From a paper:
The dimerization manner of TcHARP is similar to that of PbHARP. However, structural analysis revealed some conformational differences between the PbHARP and TcHARP dimers, especially in the HB regions. Further analysis showed that the overall folds of the two TcHARP monomers are similar to that of PbHARP monomer A (or C), the conformational differences are mainly caused by the bending of α8 of PbHARP monomer B (or D), hinged at residue E147. At higher concentration of salt (200–500 mM), it exists as dimer; however, it assembles into larger oligomers in buffer containing 100 mM salt. The apo-form structures of PbHARP and TcHARP are also in an inactive form.
Interestingly, recent studies showed that pre-tRNA 5’-end can also be cleaved by protein-only RNase Ps (PRORP). Like the eukaryotic PRORPs, HARPs are members of the PIN domain superfamily, but belong to a different subgroup (PIN_5 cluster). Compared to eukaryotic PRORP, HARP is much shorter and it lacks both PPR and the central domains. Like Aq_880 from A. aeolicus, in vitro cleavage assays showed that PbHARP, TcHARP, TmHARP and TrHARP can all remove the 5’-end of pre-tRNA, suggesting that pre-tRNA 5’-end processing is one conserved activity of HARP.
Residue numbers in the entry:
A (entry chain A): 1 to 197
B (entry chain B): 1 to 192
């Protein structure tokens, strides 16, 4: 049994809280389950996803588990074929993520700026935040593709709280589970396989 | 012989001028060649590309040719498989198209915003121009994929002046020609 993990159960405050009060504690709780399933169940992340979660998590404090129990593996691309509609999936993902980023970038400017600020100061704040929304929207959509393609090739279950990802997985015939229910699934996997829970 | 046409030879002033002084004139000149090659050479556009060209071209003033000699055909997507690296090509294309838009949005904001605008007005000018850059960057990248996939399925030659599209065609082993030389290519086909 193989799982491909999105950032959700570690970095999304409304789902990672089922595992811990911080990303580091959430990861620690996850790794305790992953350790108890070592050799029976494998957990994968594309490298770009892993780099995002460990921006928030204390990697040094979670050795050896953080390196042994999460497999960092980019999907294979050479000689691999995918449905053509995947391109439309990626396009909607980019538009979905960028539109949200623009709102976030706008709301961020409207909290920092005061009516007395000059024109150039206002423009540089919006341009900076808009540029960040675009670049993050693009990388994250590519990372979404990596997750999908990795789980497809591994015949693994995707673990995410992102509705767009789960619908995309569904359409491609990829197994998935809602990340909000992942701890429940992990608890049931330990009980099905033995050992202290 | 089959050709898949980008907007270039109709809407890009630096390329269509080789066919006519306006998009309508360019289309008229092109249809002149396309009519005389009817039955020998077929010309295709994805529907989204066609709608873009005829926003600038008076479709009414060019009947019957504009309807007979250009085949509007979306690529097939159902049950179609593509190489996975196409998605990476599309990602680079999106970034390329968005980057171009940012320059357009940049100059447009720079001219539109004035010292007197309140905070709401500056934000609305910036948001409006950036959203338009994003929207067009997204549509153009999807149309670029439609062009690419169409030419793939037809084994047709892409006709474009867009560096992104030609590089994408090259990587995928799709025939292409620089649209700046298309009239010259058409002239040589007609003499045949």
């Amino acid at each position: 049994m193989r799982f491909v993990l999105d950032t959700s159960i570690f970095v999304n405050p409304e789902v990672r809280d089922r595992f811990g009060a911080s990303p580091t504690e959430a990861m620690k709780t996850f790794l305790d389950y992953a350790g108890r399933l070592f050799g029976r169940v494998e957990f994968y992340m594309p490298p770009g996803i892993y780099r995002e979660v460990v921006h928030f998590v204390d990697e040094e404090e979670l050795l050896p588990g953080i390196e042994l129990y999460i497999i960092k593996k980019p999907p294979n691309v050479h000689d691999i074929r995918i449905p053509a509609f995947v391109v439309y999936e990626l396009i909607e993902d980019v538009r979905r993520r960028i539109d949200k980023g623009l709102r976030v970038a706008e709301k961020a400017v409207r909290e920092s700026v005061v009516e007395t600020d000059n024109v150039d100061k206002i423009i540089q704040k919006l341009r900076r935040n808009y540029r960040r929304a675009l670049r993050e929207g693009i990388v994250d959509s590519k990372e979404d593709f990596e997750l999908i393609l990795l789980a497809k090739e591994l015949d693994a279950t995707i673990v995410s709280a992102d509705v767009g990802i789960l619908t995309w997985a569904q359409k491609m015939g990829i197994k998935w589970v809602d990340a909000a229910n992942f701890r429940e699934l992990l608890e049931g996997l330990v009980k099905k396989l033995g050992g202290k829970n």
